[PDB]
Specification:
Chain C: The modification O-(pantetheine 4'-phosphoryl)serine is found at residue 40. This is part of a larger assembly, with 13 protein chains of twelve kinds. Chain E is mainly α. Chain E contains two helices and one strand; from the N terminus they run E-H-H. In chain E, 43% of the residues lie in helices and 3% in strands. Chain K has helices at 26-54, 79-114, 118-121, 123-140, 149-168. The chains are: A mainly alpha, B mainly alpha, C mainly alpha, D mainly alpha, E mainly alpha, F mainly alpha, G mainly alpha, H mainly alpha, J mainly alpha, K mainly alpha, L little secondary structure, M mainly alpha. The interface between G and K is medium-sized, with 26 and 26 residues. Residues 155-156, 159, 162-163, 166, 191, 194-195, 197-198, 201, 205 of chain H line the site of one 1,2-Distearoyl-sn-glycerophosphoethanolamine.
Chain lengths: 108, 60, 84, 42, 67, 121, 103, 459, 182, 171, 170, 12, 155
């Protein structure tokens, strides 16, 4: 029985058919990815290991993230309006008729 | 875990219902609900315990 | 409390209970491939016994590099903060 | 091999584990009902 | 410490731990035997359960059928 | 058990309904049937502060046991005979409820037989 | 798959530093340089005095002269009365029960 | 009220005539003395309010808000003096003057008998508040925050002025004591529908009502610490105080006019609580938390029950201390790492053990742990809205769960986990900061012993 | 290797599984008897009884895999229970697990009328199902020692992964809530 | 990124660990471990690399079907019961800079030795930065590997945070 | 210390000790220890304090509010009369709240005092509680947070009109 | 042997 | 940080895609924006919807608790994918099968409880009998009214 991936449960890497057919193009892309990672690692490390540095190492990726993120509207109000309005009309009708029990109700 | 599971938190839920037995003893509908809730609970969790390998989880 | 000699004693002790290794040829510097004639399957099983001996996991990326008893002693000493 | 040798060679069974202490618990019990049967006869 | 670790061997035991364990294991079994001797009905049944089929129609007040 | 198999997996017309018993007059088949006699008075059960569910036809044995239990403190192993008398009265009380069930069951069977006699006639 | 000669040399150089660093975390003999059954019962006796007797004195004084002086602050369940008891306040005797049928 | 107005005014010459290096000592010390005397306002009677003069009065609603106002001024001074240390002396004195002038307008606003006087003072608070944000905020978009804050307010406040002047013409007076006796019922008509909206929308914007709330997170992200403190603790409650007063003359029209605002509030409190679970700016998270809490206050005021009004009063006081404390806690991290990003500096309990305790206590009050006055106020509202309609318990209960989730999420994210490796400037907490946190939480928790002084006139 | 810990664990397990006259027996068997003779939901009664059987199985599982057989722990033996704080604290609870149920049951006033008349098969149900649970558990535990390899069944995975309730609910519910803001 | 040889060896180790979770008993595990090894030794000399990749892919399909749903995890491995347990006690060494002078006075020997390390760090840094400039091609590093020191008295570049990291059991 | 008519309690009936055992009662010896070690020193401190109190006897008084005309007698918009009537109505409202609180305290004390016999023996308290709550509900319920003597009167007149109509249809 | 425990300053 | 380093509008031409990939430290082959709607993602990259729990725990992350490296682009929903929140890791049992087995188990139990209510267990006895008209006065009945007698008989 094959694995069926879901949004909340990914395909395992050992079962992914593209993990076993790795061509020159795929290897070249992985090297380009490792090179980008290594360049950022060095840039981070020259500051992180700098004995004279005291502070925070500002991360442009973090700043871009918070900037990007800091940058179903009447239907529930109408829905809730009819739920509470219908309930309170029913309740008000019974009190006027005396059919609602409020024997010990003196806090409101 | 020893104190959470024995003399403090988890029995509080049971204790609350015991405090209110003057009301629950006159309510068959409430009795049916708590009965079935406990029954499914006692069986389901005991069934989970049969295969657990972590000693603390078996006791939990 | 582990010591550098204590770790080394137990690493060789485990290897001296492995039938594919002759305990007379074994030293701390014996390469598992070049001196003892083992294969990489064998090397994986040696690392697994070390993990069992000391009760912690050696990730595959590090484990593949450990090719003699001394490199295992160094690796265990470094992760356990053993300086003596 | 060390796991099957020395002080680990023989371990009790499940029944033997449950019966740990039975011998002296029974000996003490026999003495107690014997004592209680004697006094009750007085 | 007062107990020193051992390698691939059964551990060192004190005489206090062994005796105390045996005492309380034996206490548990004495208690069970003592209680069972005196309160076996707590396990087996406190009273006889009647067989309703053995009751007569006279005592249940069942009149004869042709009546 | 067994009585449940007869009702749910058999003929329920001749099986008592536990929520509607009894369904025959108490004196049907019992000429001169005595009443159950209550020993403890209402005031005695009130003063003893018995739980309402304990204020039944065995309450006098309970009142005796509770008084013994208080008087024997700290000896919490005494009053064992008083407790058995209360437990025994409850047992007999339970047997009486079993007989009421068995009487009801047989009267429902007699009625069923008396209906095939007429269905034949 | 073993180490390369440069990987081994870097690891060796780091190892020497790490062990020297770890050795230097050991304290010296003078560190820290700090600024300038009777015992059983006495320790237990002082504990009972401060943590039981003094608190109970305070609580009793508080319950007796402030709490119980207000209506319905400490409400008791009234004592159970059994057939045959004698009331202390009045001297009343509670009649026995009716005689039991044999059982 | 002159015994509070005049000494507050005298804080201005005190600050300007102080020795250069004594401006924070003198202003802080003397503002604390004014705060002490504010407790004389507790002479409240069971029947009558404390009516000083033809201009000012103090009942059990205004008194707790007055005490909170005058308590907050020294705290804002303490909180501000560090990030203003490099400012030149004249601009420091001008900053302190804005805070003093804000106190002056606020205590007059809360004690005015006549509603036009309340309106002018209610409007006057805008000026120093706007100046504090646009002049002493750090970032470029403080200018936009000022315009949003300014024009949201005036979009609602100008209709209120027209309604207030209209009411005086019809009734003959706007003295609040007179309105209590000459109030007449509001009958159904389109004219009265717009009178109702004109009487209420200005206060809705201040609270802020859900759907008119987007100015608030914008304002907080731009304001300096003192700006956030006064905004969160007092300025929002001007709208709450205004609604509690003006609803007197809006019956029985409030019966059906409240519905759309109750729906916005009841649903809005769930929406804003959920939004807090995904906020990445710590100040913006606290700002959205205020919106959710103030939604309860709006519901309490609109359903108009004795229990709801008591809960509204307690919630307003309790939120003011709690939210002000959270901005102060958030600001203490900011003064070290110079970022409001919540995920930047983690595991701070390892580095700042006692500040972790303050974070814990602020979070516990934010999620309304019994018996904090935070829970007392929330519980009373939950009690009263259940009678209004039993189904509301579902939305109230769900909001409690989400509030606990984001309150503790804040605590776990910043204080727990591992510390960020490269942040190596987390210096030990200063005495000033520890005192500032304790000067919020201690009075807040002491109010548990005597809640009646914060439950308002319906007590 | 750990005698006192072993004694307390055996006592605790037998107390848990309703061993006659230990502390647990004085409540569980009254509860099972009261349930057996009550006007009750029949399905709930059966579930409770099967669960009583299952208690025996997982208790045997702890005892069997922790105390019996051969050591499966690492080679450096640091087993040591000879600490008075450890022995004494467990000792006081071990005494509680023997007599507390008996002492408490003989001192508390009666507030109900306990059911004491019932058929023998309702009287002994908890004991019988408990004994069958132990017997069943011992056959399964010893089958792990055979040189046979077993594939996982669906019931095994359902049990091991907790009916999948945590996997589904703890991924889906947070995802739906944490996403609906956007 | 992983070679074929690395994937097979990773699978063997992963398969053996799950097999142990199933077998539990050491004698039973030894028996089945040897059978498992014989399955790998069967195809050890497969020179057709398309066939070898098919063998591994089916092997990983087999592993996914037969894996233990609750495998044993070493306590301090990721996902284990002691993983990260001691992180709360790890305190970075820069925190000592902020100690009050009276606190530092309690450990005069320790803090004098700490100053020597800080001096060693300061005097080494420029040579480390220079060594990395000389050895890094124009495009920048293509990998994350760092070099050893090449002279006497040099320290391996970027050593401080490795050498002075918190102890695994710091308190 | 308080009025026994306002907060009544029935006479107390304590049975005498009646031991049916030769074992000593631990509670009796703890009681004697409590008297000697706790009560007597506590009583000695209190008697010293009361001796200081007797040297300085001074009094406080319960404030008496004259009755003033009700809102029914106030001309419309006459705030001087309305003010006094409104203040009087507010004082009465607080008093009626405490009257209900007294009756609820009676009920709760009876429930605890009567034990397992409360359902029968607390009927008189239950009835008095039922009536005062009904009267209190009629006066003050549903007025809203902006309550007043005016709104209270409007409710009474609405109730009076409903009672007049119902009597007419009969 | 006794090892120095690195912790944040507690003096303040 | 300059404006050119901050998130921008959705990339229109292929030369804006290359600039956007470079700004976010990505290969232009890998870079891919969110679909151009009014949703408001701009040019922020759309990265795989995976939990941080799925990352290699042994790699030397700059942020080990988050498993992020300094400078790498962060998933738009990173705050949802931290290790304390939503996990997307592969499961030993397929997602759909798990849902069936859990739903099937709960549904079967709820049905059986319904059956157990309709055919309850009980014992073969009649009602429990109480004296004094089923304890009329004790249960709170009106003393002034006279209850309709309940009479119990011996059997
Ligand atoms: C432009 C919108 C104005 C709405 C119309 C209000 C109006 O003109 O009503 C006239 C009425 C005065 O008529 P009058 O003869 O005195 O009394 C008999 C009532 N027909 O006026 C009245 O009776 C009440 C007047 C109240 C004043 C209303 C103030 C403006 C209302 C519109 C704004 C309300 C919404 C606020 C939105 C805020 C946005 C943030
Ligand atoms: C009624 C009102 C309902 C209100 C529900 C609020 C929904 C909140 C959902 C969480 C929101 C996100 C906050 C962060 C929580 C989170 O995401 O953590 C996930 C956490 C994972 O925990 P774990 O499975 O142990 O794995 C950890 C090892 N990686 O797992 C968690 O801690 C979250 C798991 C809880 C998910 C909610 C499910 C609640 C159960 C609902 C079904 C029961 C029906 C109601 C009860 C019936 C009573 C008979
Ligand atoms: C209220 C009273 C309750 C009943 C009280 C009964 C008294 C209990 C007395 C227990 C004392 C027994 O003392 C203990 O007995 C066991 C008998 O196997 C001894 O054990 C002995 O045999 C076992 C092997 O089977 C091994 O441990 C070893 O060969 C030897 O020690 C312990 O070494 C001894 O310490
Ligand atoms: C006739 C109608 C007008 C009535 C005017 C009544 C007030 C007259 C005040 C005259 C004195 C002014 O005093 C003059 O200004 C300020 C404050 O006073 C002083 O200088 C000030 O410098 C700084 C503030 O910047 C502070 O240290 C301190 O406030 C003070 O020393 C001058 O050294 C003094 O020469
Ligand atoms: C967020 C904003 C929320 C806004 C909520 C809006 C609520 C809308 C309320 C609608 C009711 C308005 O008020 C309504 O006005 C009309 C005016 O013609 C009144 O009715 C009056 O005019 C109509 C003419 O059509 C006549 O038939 C009627 O005899 C007369 O009395 C109603 O008596 C009143 O009920
Ligand atoms: C309420 C608490 C009640 C506690 C009740 C305790 C119940 C204990 C039930 C034990 C039933 C007997 O269990 C029996 O043990 C013997 C031990 O030789 C075993 O019998 C056989 O099986 C195993 C495995 O093949 C062998 O190790 C054993 O030598 C052999 O005789 C079985 O495992 C089982 O048939
Ligand atoms: C005393 C215990 C009392 C409670 C006992 C409860 C047991 C009730 C179990 C009900 C759940 C059964 O759930 C059912 O299982 C089978 C077997 O996988 C599934 O069947 C499906 O999956 C299997 C395996 O992939 C395949 O045959 C195929 O995909 C499909 O048939 C059904 O889709 C599901 O509906
Ligand atoms: C006789 O006294 C009945 C006692 C009950 C025995 C338990 C039977 C459980 C059967 C399962 C019920 C299925 C749902 C209707």
């Amino acid at each position: 029985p094959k694995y069926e991936a879901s949004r909340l449960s990914s395909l395992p890497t050992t079962l992914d058919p593209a993990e076993y057919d790795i061509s020159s193009e795929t290897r070249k892309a992985q090297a380009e990815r490792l090179a980008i990672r290594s360049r950022l690692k060095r840039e981070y490390q020259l500051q992180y290991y700098d004995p004279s540095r005291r502070g925070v190492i500002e991360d442009p990726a973090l700043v871009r993230w918070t900037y990007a993120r800091s940058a179903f509207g009447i239907g529930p109000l109408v829905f809730w309006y009819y739920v509470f309005k219908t309930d309170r009309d029913r309740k008000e009708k019974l009190i006027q008729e005396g059919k609602l029990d409020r024997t010990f109700n003196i806090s409101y | 875990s020893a104190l959470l599971h024995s003399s403090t938190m988890v029995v509080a839920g049971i204790f609350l219902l015991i405090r209110f037995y003057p009301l629950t003893e006159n309510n068959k509908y409430i009795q049916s609900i708590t009965l079935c809730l406990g029954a499914i609970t006692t069986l389901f969790t005991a069934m989970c315990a049969l295969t657990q390998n972590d000693i603390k989880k078996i006791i939990a | 409390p582990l010591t550098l000699e204590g770790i080394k004693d137990r690493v060789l002790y485990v290897l001296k209970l492995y039938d594919k290794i002759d305990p007379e040829k074994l030293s701390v510097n014996s390469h598992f491939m070049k001196d003892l004639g083992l294969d990489s399957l064998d090397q994986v099983e040696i690392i697994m016994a070390m993990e069992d001996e000391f009760g912690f996991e050696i990730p595959d990326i590090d484990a593949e590099k450990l090719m003699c008893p001394q490199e295992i002693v160094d690796y265990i000493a470094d992760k356990k903060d053993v300086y003596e | 091999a060390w796991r099957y040798m020395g002080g680990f060679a023989n371990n009790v069974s499940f029944v033997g584990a449950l019966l740990k202490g039975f011998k002296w618990g029974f000996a003490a019990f026999v003495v107690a009902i014997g004592a209680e049967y004697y006094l009750e006869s007085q | 410490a007062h107990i020193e670790p051992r390698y691939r061997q059964f551990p060192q035991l004190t005489r206090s731990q062994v005796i105390q364990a045996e005492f309380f294991s034996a206490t548990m079994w004495f208690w069970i035997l003592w209680r069972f001797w005196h309160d076996s009905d707590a396990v087996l049944g406190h009273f006889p359960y009647p067989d309703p089929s053995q009751w007569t129609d006279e005592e249940l007040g069942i009149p004869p059928d042709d009546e | 058990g067994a009585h449940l198999a007869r009702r749910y997996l058999g003929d329920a017309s001749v099986e008592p309904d536990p929520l509607r018993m009894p369904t025959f007059p108490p004196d049907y088949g019992f000429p001169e049937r005595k009443e159950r006699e209550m020993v403890a008075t209402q005031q005695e059960m009130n003063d003893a502060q018995l739980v309402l569910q304990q204020r039944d036809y065995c309450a006098h044995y309970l009142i005796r046991f509770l008084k013994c239990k208080r008087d024997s403190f700290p000896n919490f192993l005494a009053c064992k005979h008083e407790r058995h008398d209360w437990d025994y009265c409850e047992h007999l009380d339970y047997v009486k409820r079993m007989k009421e069930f068995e009487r009801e069951r047989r009267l429902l069977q007699r009625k069923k037989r008396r209906e095939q006699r007429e269905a034949d006639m | 798959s073993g180490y390369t000669p440069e990987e081994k040399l870097r690891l060796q150089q780091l190892r020497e530093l790490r062990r020297r660093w770890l050795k230097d975390q050991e304290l010296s003999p003078r560190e820290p340089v700090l600024p300038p059954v009777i015992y059983k019962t006495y320790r237990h006796s002082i504990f009972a005095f401060t943590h039981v007797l003094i608190p109970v004195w305070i609580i009793h004084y508080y319950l007796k002269y402030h709490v119980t002086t207000k209506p319905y602050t400490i409400v008791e369940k009234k004592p159970r009365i059994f057939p045959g008891d004698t009331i202390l306040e009045t001297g009343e005797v509670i009649p026995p029960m009716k005689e039991f049928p044999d059982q | 009220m002159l015994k509070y107005i005049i000494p507050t005014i005298m804080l201005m010459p005190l600050t300007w005539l102080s020795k250069n290096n004594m401006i924070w000592v003198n202003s802080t010390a003397h503002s604390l003395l004014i705060s002490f005397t504010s407790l004389l306002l507790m002479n409240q009677f069971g029947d009558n309010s404390l009516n000083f003069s033809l201009l000012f009065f103090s009942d059990s609603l205004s008194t707790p808000l007055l005490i909170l106002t005058m308590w907050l001024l020294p705290l804002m001074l303490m909180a501000s003096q560090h990030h203003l240390s490099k400012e030149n002396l004249t601009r420091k004195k001008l900053f302190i003057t804005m805070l003093i002038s804000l106190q002056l307008f606020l205590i007059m606003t809360f004690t005015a008998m006549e509603l036009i006087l309340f309106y002018i003072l209610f409007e006057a608070t805008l000026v120093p508040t706007l100046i504090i944000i646009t002049r002493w905020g750090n970032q470029t978009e403080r200018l936009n925050a000022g315009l949003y804050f300014l024009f949201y307010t005036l979009a609602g406040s100008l209709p209120l002025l027209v309604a207030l002047i209209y009411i005086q013409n019809t009734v003959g007076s706007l003295n609040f004591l007179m309105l209590q006796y000459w109030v007449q019922p509001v009958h159904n008509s389109w004219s009265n529908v717009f009178m109702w909206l004109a009487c209420m929308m200005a206060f809705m914007v201040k609270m802020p009502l859900y759907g008119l709330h987007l100015w608030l997170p914008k304002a907080h992200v731009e304001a300096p610490i003192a700006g956030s403190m006064v905004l969160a603790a007092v300025l929002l409650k001007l709208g709450g105080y205004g609604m509690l007063r003006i609803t007197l003359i809006l019956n029985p029209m409030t019966d059906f006019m409240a519905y759309p605002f109750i729906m916005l509030s009841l649903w809005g409190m769930i929406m804003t609580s959920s939004i807090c679970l995904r906020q990445t700016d710590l100040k913006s998270l606290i700002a959205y938390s205020s919106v959710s809490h103030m939604a309860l206050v709006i519901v309490a005021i609109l359903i108009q029950t004795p229990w709801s009004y008591m809960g509204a009063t307690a919630l307003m006081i309790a939120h003011g201390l709690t939210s002000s404390m959270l901005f102060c806690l958030a600001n203490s991290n900011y003064e070290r790492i110079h970022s409001r990003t919540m995920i930047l500096a983690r595991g701070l309990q390892t580095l700042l053990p006692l500040m972790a305790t303050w974070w814990l206590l602020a979070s516990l009050t934010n999620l309304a742990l019994p018996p904090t006055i935070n829970l007392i106020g929330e519980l009373f509202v939950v009690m009263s809205t259940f009678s209004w309609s039993n189904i509301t318990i579902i939305l109230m209960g769900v909001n409690m769960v989400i509030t606990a989730l984001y309150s503790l999420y804040m605590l776990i994210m910043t204080q727990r986990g591992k510390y960020t490796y490269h942040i190596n400037n987390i210096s030990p907490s200063f005495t000033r900061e520890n005192a500032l946190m304790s000067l919020h939480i201690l009075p807040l928790l002491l109010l548990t012993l005597n809640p009646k002084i914060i439950l308002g006139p319906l007590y | 290797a750990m005698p006192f810990t072993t004694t307390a664990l055996i006592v605790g397990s037998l107390a848990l599984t309703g061993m006659p006259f230990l502390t647990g027996f004085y409540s569980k068997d009254l509860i099972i008897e009261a349930a057996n003779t009550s006007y009750t939901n029949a399905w709930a009664l059966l579930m409770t009884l099967i669960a009583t059987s299952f208690t025996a199985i997982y208790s045997t599982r702890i005892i069997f895999f922790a105390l019996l057989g051969q050591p499966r722990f690492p080679t450096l033996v640091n087993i040591n229970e000879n600490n008075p704080l450890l022995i004494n604290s467990i000792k006081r609870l071990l005494i509680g697990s023997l007599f507390a149920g008996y002492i408490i049951s003989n001192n508390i006033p009666p507030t109900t009328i306990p059911q004491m008349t019932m058929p023998y098969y309702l009287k002994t149900t908890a004991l019988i199902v408990t004994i069958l649970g132990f017997i069943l558990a011992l056959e399964i535990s010893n089958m792990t020692k055979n040189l046979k390899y077993h594939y996982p069944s669906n019931a095994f995975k359902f049990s091991t992964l907790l009916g999948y309730f945590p996997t589904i609910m703890h991924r889906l519910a947070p995802y739906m809530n944490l996403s609906m803001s956007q | 990124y992983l070679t074929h040889q690395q994937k097979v060896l990773r699978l063997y180790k992963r398969a053996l660990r799950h097999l142990e979770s199933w077998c539990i008993h050491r004698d039973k595990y030894r028996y089945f471990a040897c059978l498992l090894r014989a399955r790998f030794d069967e195809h050890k000399n497969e020179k057709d690399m398309v066939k070898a990749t098919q063998l591994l892919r089916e092997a990983e399909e087999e592993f996914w079907h037969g894996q233990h749903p609750q495998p044993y995890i070493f306590p301090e491995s990721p996902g284990g019961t002691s993983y990260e347990r001691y992180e709360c006690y790890k305190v970075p060494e820069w925190c000592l800079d902020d100690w009050h002078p009276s606190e530092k006075a309690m450990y005069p020997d320790y803090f004098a030795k700490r100053e020597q390390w800080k001096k060693l760090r300061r005097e080494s840094w420029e040579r480390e930065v220079k060594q990395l400039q000389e050895e890094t091609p124009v495009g920048g590093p293509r990998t994350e590997a760092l070099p050893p020191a090449r002279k006497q008295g040099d320290l391996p570049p970027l050593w401080w945070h490795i050498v002075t990291r918190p102890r695994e059991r710091p308190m | 210390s308080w009025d026994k008519d306002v907060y009544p309690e029935p006479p107390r009936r304590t049975p005498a000790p009646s031991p049916q055992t030769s074992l000593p009662n631990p509670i009796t010896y703890l009681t004697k220890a409590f008297d000697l070690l706790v009560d007597r020193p506590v009583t000695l401190v209190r008697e010293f304090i009361e001796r200081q109190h007797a040297k300085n006897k001074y009094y406080y008084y319960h404030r008496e509010f004259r009755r003033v005309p009700d809102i029914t007698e106030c001309q419309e918009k006459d705030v001087l009369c309305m003010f006094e009537a409104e203040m009087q109505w507010r004082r009465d409202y607080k008093v009626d709240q405490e009257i209900v609180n007294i009756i609820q305290e009676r009920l709760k004390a009876c429930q605890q005092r009567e034990g397992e016999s409360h359902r029968q023996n607390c009927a008189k308290e239950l009835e008095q509680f039922t009536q005062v709550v009904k009267a209190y509900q009629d006066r003050y319920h549903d007025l809203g947070a902006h309550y007043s003597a005016r709104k209270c009167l409007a409710k009474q007149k609405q109730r009076m009109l409903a009672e007049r109509k119902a009597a007419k249809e009969a | 042997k006794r090892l120095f425990i690195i912790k944040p300053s507690g003096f303040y | 940080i300059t404006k050119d380093m901050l998130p921008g509008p959705y990339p229109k031409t292929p030369e804006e895609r290359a600039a956007a990939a470079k700004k976010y430290n990505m290969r232009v082959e890998d870079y891919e924006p969110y679909p151009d709607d009014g949703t408001g993602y701009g040019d922020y990259p759309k990265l795989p919807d995976r939990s941080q729990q799925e990352r290699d725990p042994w790699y030397d992350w700059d942020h080990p608790d988050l498993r992020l490296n300094w400078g790498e682009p962060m998933h738009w929903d990173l705050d949802m994918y931290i290790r304390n929140r939503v996990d997307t890791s592969p499961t030993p049992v397929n997602w759909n099968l798990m849902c069936k087995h859990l739903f099937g188990f709960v549904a079967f139990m709820l049905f059986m409880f319904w059956v157990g209510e309709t055919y309850p267990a009980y014992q073969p006895v009649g009602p429990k009998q109480y004296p004094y008209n089923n304890l009329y006065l004790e249960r709170g009945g009106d003393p002034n009214k006279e209850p309709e007698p309940v009479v119990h008989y011996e059997i």
